[model samples]
Target chain A: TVMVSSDYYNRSTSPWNLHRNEDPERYPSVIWEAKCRHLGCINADGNVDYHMNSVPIQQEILVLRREPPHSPNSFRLEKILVSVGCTCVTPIVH
Target chain B: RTVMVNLPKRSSDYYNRSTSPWNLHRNEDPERYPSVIWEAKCRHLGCINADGNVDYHMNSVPIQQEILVLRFRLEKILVSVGCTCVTPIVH
Candidate 1:
């Protein structure tokens, strides 16, 4: 259950700059990056190998929960609710 | 930063007892209890204001739990990857 948003920089002036240039510590991108690593969505070398194809960008919410035979470490996504507004931000260039 | 190794598992009884019926305005509605169990759990894990609600950003049990789990996992990764840190780095 992570909330992600894209911060787009002006492509005309700074195509290289796709983010807001905020401190990573204060940004949600850093948080989600860490999460991706934990969820095995990313690799040890910090590469996104898995695609979150189910993740929606509209007024929807993504949920991750633990499945049955629950161990302290086991988790499974419960559901992704459409028509929901859970606000946060992640940066990407268009 | 005390890295929690043996993370406390929320028992079924605990969840059943603590969880309130889902409400539309649970976040803004002060009359509701707003999932204090999750709030306390997050606070215990050092992430404050994790109310387990949908109004504020990053407010949910799974999200908060993920953060705690990730902190532990990241620490293990750091140690295994030979970063300049001790195993179970307790800050």
Candidate 2:
């Protein structure tokens, strides 16, 4: 058997928030086999959102695997994450 | 008299069981959870009407069909024989 779950947050709007229906507590479930991936980008003021000295909202993936102690079969779990952002540069030339 | 029942031919194209260097025969067992059933429960509860039943609920046939479609496409890439894997790639 195989299972998967995910959660997402929309921070751009007021009351920025996150929500999840599966694994609401963000606990890692045992995986018998797994694969995960994600990607993200940000757009602010019609330009790429870049953050100085910060990790841009980048995509990420999490996974877990496991096998039954007595059974001959196995299972897996996978998750994907995406982050996007933007930044402004301060001019120094006077 | 002993009689053998006629049965369909058993194809040798059975699942591989490799174990060295993570070869094809090597089994990749993965962990999994009941995410769909859990989600269904969550949505049903979240969308329940005053009548104490899920509203705007799709029929079981449709849900089963949707699950079948999802499983066919999902298992191809997310699982291997009996393993499960998560791909962060979004559509």
Candidate 3:
């Protein structure tokens, strides 16, 4: 969604650098990060903890779609982010 | 909005009905149609995710129908995106 002007930097360098000094990997991918907070959970002692909300943290898959006038060819393809949520749907244990 | 349909010798009636209005424009001019042939696999499940390059939130849905065009005489072909909502069969 963000477009940095590639024309601004010098392209002649062997290992070209843009906004960052020497490496591109050092920068974060700029993708979304998701966290979940569950309200309650049963304790190992078999009693429910009612005082504070149990923070059951996790992530979910993000599905995106786009169509003509966006793509040069106007061909549509389903873009999917297979995040932590995808793991939940699959059988984890054999 | 597009409805998915099987292709590659599935049936002419199926393809004919699935044709896009864009094809009508192309028929009026052979130079304008984009390509000679285009094809895609039929998705069997779930809504298609957004391609992320365009703002088509309201138009986004699992495609239930589409069009593939090829001109034998002129040797021109192209794929056109369409929707069930716009087509009569879907109604």
Candidate 4:
């Protein structure tokens, strides 16, 4: 019964880096992403803390890669999973 | 809202004509959320985990009723939609 917030961001580097770092690569071409807030589901009772069931929604993107000192920008299909959204589900521990 | 019949697949979840199945994925009624296919491309594949595992929550009441009345055994199929990376949840 909850609606997830939808949003977007202009990204460089990997989304796995949770901390925001604008751009840190040789190929400074801009890449964009549809992103969301990283939130954990809070229990009705804050005292009862459980594992925050959060995970990333990702897209496999192809990026331009620089191979060493004088390498030309080449088209390499890299499945870099960019963090698009985060979801939190209450865990069902068996 | 999409509506469909509930059929008997298990004793615990016994179905009948009186009770109707609710289209739980209301946000994606196939009209409003065009990205239900989740297709964005140049083109590769993907997900946005907003609540749990990124999934296409679907409804099948219309199909269920037809199949139920038609007297064909219906089987639910599972699908793998996308990929993402994360660390294990532990201490």
Stronger candidate by TM-score (1 vs 4): 4
After best superposition, candidate 1 residue B17: deviation in angstroms? 44
Full ranking by lDDT: 4, 3, 2, 1
Please report how far candidate 4 places residue A50 from its true position, in Å: 2.9
- Name the DockQ score for candidate 1: 0.02
DockQ of predicted model 4: 0.03
Q: Score the docking of each candidate (DockQ).
A: 0.02, 0.02, 0.02, 0.03
Candidate 1's displacement at residue A81, Å, is: 1.2
Q: Which stretches of candidate 1 lie over 4 Å from their true place?
A: A1-58, A85-94, B1-91
**What class would a CAPRI assessor give candidate 4's docking?**
incorrect
Q: Which residue pairs in model 4 clash with each other?
A: B4-B61
The residue-level lDDT of candidate 3 at A67 comes to 28
The residue pairs that clash in candidate 1, if any, are A5-A89, A5-A90, A6-A90, A7-A91, B1-B91
**Top model by DockQ, which number?**
4
Instruction: Tell me the TM-score of chain B in each candidate.
Output: 0.16, 0.15, 0.17, 0.20
**What range of 10 consecutive residues in model 4 chain B has the weakest lDDT sum?**
B62-71
Local distance difference test, candidate 2: 0.20
Q: What's each prediction's TM-score?
A: 0.15, 0.18, 0.17, 0.31
User: Among these predicted structures, which one has the highest lDDT?
Assistant: 4
Ten residues in a row with the worst lDDT in model 2 chain A? A7-16
Worst 10 residues of 1 chain B by lDDT: B78-87
